Amino acid sequence: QGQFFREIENLKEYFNASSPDVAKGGPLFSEILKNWKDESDKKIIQSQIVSFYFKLFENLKDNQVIQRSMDIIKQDMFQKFLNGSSEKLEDFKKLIQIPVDDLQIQRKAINELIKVMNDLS
Amino acid sequence: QFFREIENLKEYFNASSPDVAKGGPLFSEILKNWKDESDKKIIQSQIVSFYFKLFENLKDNQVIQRSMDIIKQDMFQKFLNGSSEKLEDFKKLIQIPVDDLQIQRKAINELIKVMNDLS
């Protein structure tokens, strides 16, 4: 709560994210978060939002100034969204990192479509 | 028709090849891990967005274009309950780049709201 606020401020500082030039261009996630506030299937949307932050942080991994801020925020997302389950986290990380432009991966995906479709229905 | 369509896609990509076995399964293991998980939509969300992104990346193979359209439409009906508002939101989220500074600032600026929603 106090370590978490400090960290978000640290990131806002680094990016210069508390300035008015930011609101310029419409919301990113805030509107969608309202649309699904009370939806029983909101995890569908939260999953995309959380994966976005993981990917963002992953690719800002070498900025020493914000490294720990990202580690703290990530750990928190992990606890709240993935119930601190380390097996769930490994799965989540594997899925978000899959490329769509790799042929070997495209074949596997097509190859597993029957199983995917059954899980959805 | 989607079943016959998956087989069409499997035929095109020559999915029965032993090459495809290399490196293990992509989603099948994960699907098992979460079969009875009350929060499985977290994982299905990532699997469905992968297919949606893949189908856009394959829009150049004209012969399989209708198979992909049929499969995609079916995922839309079953996973997003055919809700067109949900589809617009989902599509918007899966297309967000992580290398655009303007978007990064927006995301950092909305982090408190995101974190509150994860409650």
Swiss-Prot record, chain A:
Protein name: Interferon gamma
Family that this chain belongs to: Belongs to the type II (or gamma) interferon family.
Species the sequence originates in: Bos taurus
Keyword Secreted: yes
The UniProt record lists the keyword Transcription regulation: no
Positions glycosylated per UniProt: 16, 83
Tissues where this protein is expressed: Released primarily from activated T lymphocytes.
GO cellular-component term (any): extracellular space
